[PDB]
Specification:
The structure is cut from a larger assembly and holds seven protein chains of seven kinds.
Chain A: H1 8-11, E1 28-33, E2 37-44, H2 53-62, E3 72-77, H3 85-102
Antiparallel strand pairs in A: 1-2, 2-3
Helix pairs in contact in A: 2-3
Chain D: E1 3-5, E2 18-22, E3 34-38, H1 40-43, H2 49-62, E4 65-66, E5 86-87, H3 94-110, E6 114-117, H4 127-136, E7 143-147, H5 155-162, E8 167-171, H6 177-182, E9 185-189, H7 190-202
Parallel strand pairs in D: 1-3, 6-9, 7-8, 7-9
Antiparallel strand pairs in D: 2-3, 4-5
Helix pairs in contact in D: 2-3, 4-5
Chain F: H1 2-9, E1 46-50, H2 51-59, H3 71-76, E2 90-94, E3 107-108, H4 114-123, E4 127-128, H5 134-141, H6 143-149, H7 164-168, H8 181-193, H9 206-210, E5 227-229, E6 234-238, H10 241-248
Parallel strand pairs in F: 1-2, 3-4
Antiparallel strand pairs in F: 5-6
Classes of the chains: A alpha+beta, B alpha+beta, C alpha+beta, D alpha/beta, E mainly alpha, F alpha/beta, G mainly alpha.
GO biological process, one term (chain A): mitochondrial translation
GO molecular function (chain A): peptidyl-tRNA hydrolase activity; translation release factor activity, codon nonspecific
EC number (chain A): 3.1.1.29
Chain lengths: ~100, ~70, ~130, ~210, ~60, ~250, ~100
């Protein structure tokens, strides 16, 4: 190959190599158009080992309305239904709730 | 009709034909060659680039010589 | 001393850059419908007197049109066979959905059907049911 | 042994192939020697004669140039007189012209005015033979002969057609609607049909060009 | 193969081969094509004629 | 085709028989008788590609999924239209189709959406941004003509200082981006969505997907300053030492 | 009658004669000569070395390159200075207000 004067080997001299929080299995996501739509994510707050006991207690208190009869905390919004937009903001809402419950 | 050669080529044809061709080659070369007089009253643009109006981008430039009259005196 | 050296090794990329002049045919897919939703015409084709061929782009020949700034329209173009048979079936199909006999104009010379209003989605789904 | 031809391009499944009798000009009685298949998208297009009518008008009018001129009152040493050379040139889209050619081909075949032939080669160069053969096969008073390419057209056919006013010999590239209409019957060589089909069938997936195809 | 466009088959006045326009455009194009090869008297007449054509189309 | 049968029954057509289609031609008025008697440039004009528009090309097989996406190939497939007279300066993406385009492929687009960048990366695609000079891009869209002109391949230009921050930004994944942050940046985006990060190295075709041309290099295949023997279907490389200095300059 | 032969254009490279008066100026330009090379490549016979810039042209390109085209390192340095200048402007606003 050919290397230019302004080549990446010189523009990025440091990295010359090619290689250069919320659990996924525990939670469950669901998206379905209902036009209108509603994307939600569900997870068992009782079995939530990734949240501290004071955080879990705060989640069960602050998110008591979001806790279902089966003890599963759910959160739904309405922005769009897709892989990244819908799902990511539902997981981040739970993460934000955990952060808010932390302090 | 329409002349095969433009009017400006009429002068060229006259130079290329007749006694003009028979003129000495050395003299013909002196007449044919043109050398620009040294500029005195106007200067060519120092920079070769300027901003084009329509596109608002840098463009090549041209030079406008100032008119100077040299009397027969 | 030549200023140029010739190598055919890198001409493969030049071949890749060459432009084609024909639209490529859709590739066979293991599972239909395609993730976008495209599905080739159903096989076997329906044995109805009228056949609707797909466009050069392998799409259903249905176009939504608005004219005079106030009239919505939908046009079927690549109609082959008995246009009258298609019109009767189209009239019957759209009468319940529309609530009355559809207002349509038949341009037999061009082999096209003009319908007031937008009903492409229902007609396109209905055409799929026929197997077109 | 019948001469069997099939369309090189994929014929639509829902459309049956168009077929006609293959003929040869070698002998008077060689009216039918084979059976050939013709693409429905080319030889079974709808008979849209307005396109043919438009093409014929275009043919007559794109070459139209009027050289009439007159002096008006100001130029006298006519209020509305001809003013110098005037042209009427205009261009039809290649899609329409190809479609017009496609429509014309179907009409001649359906009207039994198109005669598909293997080759134009003739046993003799006498113009009399060609005229007699046309009478033998009950061809129209005017017969148009088309060959694949101008350079290779047989010498014997050239002499016969060159001396005949009503029988005109043209190459494949020279085909035009006006000649087909002016000539009662059309004679086409088998290679020419494939040549015409390829160009006509090329219209498929007509990429709008940003530059000449070449 | 579209190597030669049918417009290329036009034979006639140079300024209107493969081209068409209104009377003013045709006259203006004619002047450009053969202006240097036109007669001095014709060129002056053409210039005067162009003036009338320009005003008629561009002001009426 | 019963219409064709009617033609056989109908008499042979002639030139005179031809008649214009009904209502095709209107009537005209002429003075023969009394009837007519009496009385912004600096801002790049980004040309975007919709995700839905992107999806069908892959699904229709218009663009080979194995081959990395190339803007020139899209022009070759007539996917997008770029007019030099319009002076189009950039390429973008359209939010449409965000919910209908689930696929992974390596691609390079002048401008990409941050949400779109991660989503395709979540699917496993590789996305980067490169700067093409608007004049160079027109040359890129039409590579054959400048070979016809005889011009040699020039070095690809660099963005103006206004656009340098965008391309140099690591999150933007530009060719001027710092590689050191890329492994960290890829990790950060995965956490944002929460998807499991697939390392580019894991992919069997990693080298093909990650292959990129030099900043000065206009073409993946052809290095800058190269020449092409179009007539002989061969590529010509300068062998003059002084020429290398020009390319270095 | 037999139709006339279809028109055929003269193929291959054609080099205009510079001395001929009729030949237009644009057909004698180096761009036209370069165009001849592109159309026919080796058949034209244009030396490939001529296509690349001459040593005197090399100096002009180097001067042109410096005048108008900065390098990546120079670009990055300019951003840092402007960022510092922008920071100073913000600091000036805070202290005066």
């Amino acid at each position: 190959t050919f290397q230019s004067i302004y080549s990446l080997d010189k523009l990025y001299p440091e990295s010359k190599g090619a290689d250069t929080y919320i659990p996924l299995d525990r939670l469950s996501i669901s998206y379905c158009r209902s036009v209108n739509s509603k994307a939600e994510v569900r997870f068992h707050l009782a079995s939530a080992d990734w949240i501290e006991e004071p955080v879990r207690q705060k989640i069960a208190l602050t998110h008591k309305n979001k806790i279902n009869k089966a003890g599963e905390l759910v959160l739904t919004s309405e922005s769009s239904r897709y892989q990244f937009r819908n799902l990511a903001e539902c997981l981040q809402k739970i993460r934000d709730m955990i952060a808010e419950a932390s302090q | 009709p329409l002349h095969r050669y433009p009017v400006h080529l009429w002068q060229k044809l006259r130079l290329r034909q007749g006694i003009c061709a028979r003129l000495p080659a050395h003299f013909l070369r002196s007449l044919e060659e043109e050398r620009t007089p040294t500029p005195v009253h106007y200067k060519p643009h120092g920079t070769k680039f300027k901003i084009n109006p329509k596109n608002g981008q840098r463009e090549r430039v041209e030079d406008v010589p100032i008119p100077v009259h040299y009397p027969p005196e | 001393n030549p200023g140029f050296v010739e190598s055919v090794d890198e001409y493969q990329f030049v071949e890749r850059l060459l432009p084609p002049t024909k639209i490529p045919e859709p590739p066979k897919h293991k599972h239909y419908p395609t993730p976008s939703g495209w599905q080739p015409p159903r096989d076997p084709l329906p044995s109805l007197p009228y056949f609707v061929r797909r466009s050069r782009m392998h799409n259903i020949p249905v176009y939504k049109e608005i004219t005079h700034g106030n009239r919505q329209m939908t046009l079927i173009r690549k109609v082959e066979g008995d246009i009258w048979a298609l019109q009767k079936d189209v009239e019957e199909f759209l009468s319940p959905l529309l609530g009355k006999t559809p207002i349509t104009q038949v341009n037999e010379v061009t082999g096209t059907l003009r319908i007031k209003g937008y009903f492409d989605e229902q007609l396109k789904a209905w055409l799929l049911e026929k197997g077109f | 042994d019948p001469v069997l031809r099939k369309c090189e391009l994929r014929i639509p499944v829902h459309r049956r192939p168009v077929q006609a009798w293959v003929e040869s000009l070698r002998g008077f009685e060689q009216e039918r020697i084979g059976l050939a298949e013709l693409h429905p998208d080319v030889f079974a297009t709808a008979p849209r004669l307005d396109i043919v009518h438009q093409v014929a008008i275009w043919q007559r009018n794109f070459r139209r140039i009027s050289y009439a001129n007159t002096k008006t009152r100001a130029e006298v040493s006519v209020a509305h007189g001809p003013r110098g050379p005037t042209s009427y040139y205009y261009m039809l889209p290649m899609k329409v012209r190809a479609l017009g050619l496609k429509v014309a081909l179907t009409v001649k075949l359906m009207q039994d005015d198109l005669h598909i032939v293997d080759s134009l080669e003739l046993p003799t160069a006498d113009p009399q033979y060609l005229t007699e053969l046309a009478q033998y096969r009950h061809w129209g008073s005017s017969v148009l002969l088309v060959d694949l390419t101008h350079e290779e057209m047989p010498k014997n056919v050239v002499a016969a057609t060159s001396g005949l006013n009503s029988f005109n010999l043209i190459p494949a590239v020279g085909l035009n609607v006006y000649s087909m209409l002016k000539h009662q019957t059309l004679v086409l060589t088998l290679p020419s049909v494939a040549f015409l089909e390829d160009k006509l069938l090329w219209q498929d997936s007509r990429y709008t060009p940003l530059y000449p195809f070449r | 193969n579209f190597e030669k466009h049918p417009k290329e088959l036009i034979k006639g006045p140079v300024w209107l081969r493969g081209w068409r326009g209104n009377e003013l455009q045709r006259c203006v194009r004619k002047k450009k094509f053969v202006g240097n090869r036109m007669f001095i008297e014709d060129l002056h007449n053409l210039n005067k004629r162009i003036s009338y054509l320009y005003k008629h189309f561009n002001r009426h | 085709g019963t219409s064709l049968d009617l033609l056989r029954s109908l008499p042979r057509v002639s030139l005179a028989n031809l008649k214009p289609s009904p209502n095709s031609r209107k009537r005209e008025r002429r003075p023969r008788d009394r009837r007519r008697g009496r009385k912004h440039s600096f801002r790049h004009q980004y040309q975007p590609l919709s995700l839905r528009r992107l999806q069908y090309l892959i699904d229709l097989g218009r663009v080979d999924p194995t081959q990395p996406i190339d803007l020139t190939q899209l022009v070759n497939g007539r996917g997008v239209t770029i007019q030099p007279l319009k002076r189009d300066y950039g390429v973008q993406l359209v939010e449409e189709g965000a919910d209908t385009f689930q696929a992974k492929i390596n691609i390079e687009v002048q401008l990409a959406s941050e949400l779109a960048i991660a989503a395709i990366e979540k699917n496993g695609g590789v996305v980067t941004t490169a700067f093409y000079d608007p004049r160079s891009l027109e040359i890129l869209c039409k590579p054959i003509p400048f070979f016809l002109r005889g011009q040699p391949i020039p070095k690809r230009m660099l963005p103006p200082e206004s656009l340098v921050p965008y391309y140099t930004d690591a999150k933007n994944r530009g060719y001027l981006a710092d590689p050191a942050k890329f492994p960290e940046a890829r990790l950060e985006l995965a956490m944002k969505f929460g998807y499991v990060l697939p390392d580019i190295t894991k992919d069997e075709l990693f080298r093909m997907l990650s292959a990129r041309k030099d900043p000065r290099q206009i073409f993946f295949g052809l290095a800058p300053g190269w020449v092409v023997n179009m007539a002989d279907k061969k590529i010509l490389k300068p062998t003059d030492e002084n020429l290398l200095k020009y390319y270095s300059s | 009658y037999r139709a006339p032969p279809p028109p055929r254009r003269r193929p291959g490279p054609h080099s205009p004669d510079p001395e001929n008066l009729l030949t237009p100026r644009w057909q004698l330009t180096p761009r036209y000569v370069a165009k001849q090379f592109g159309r026919h490549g080796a058949i034209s016979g244009v030396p490939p070395a001529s296509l690349w810039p001459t040593p005197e042209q090399l100096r002009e390109l180097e001067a042109e390159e410096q005048e108008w085209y900065p390098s990546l390192a120079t670009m990055q340095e300019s951003l840092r200075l402007q960022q510092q200048a922008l920071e100073a402007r913000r600091q000036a606003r805070e202290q005066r207000i």
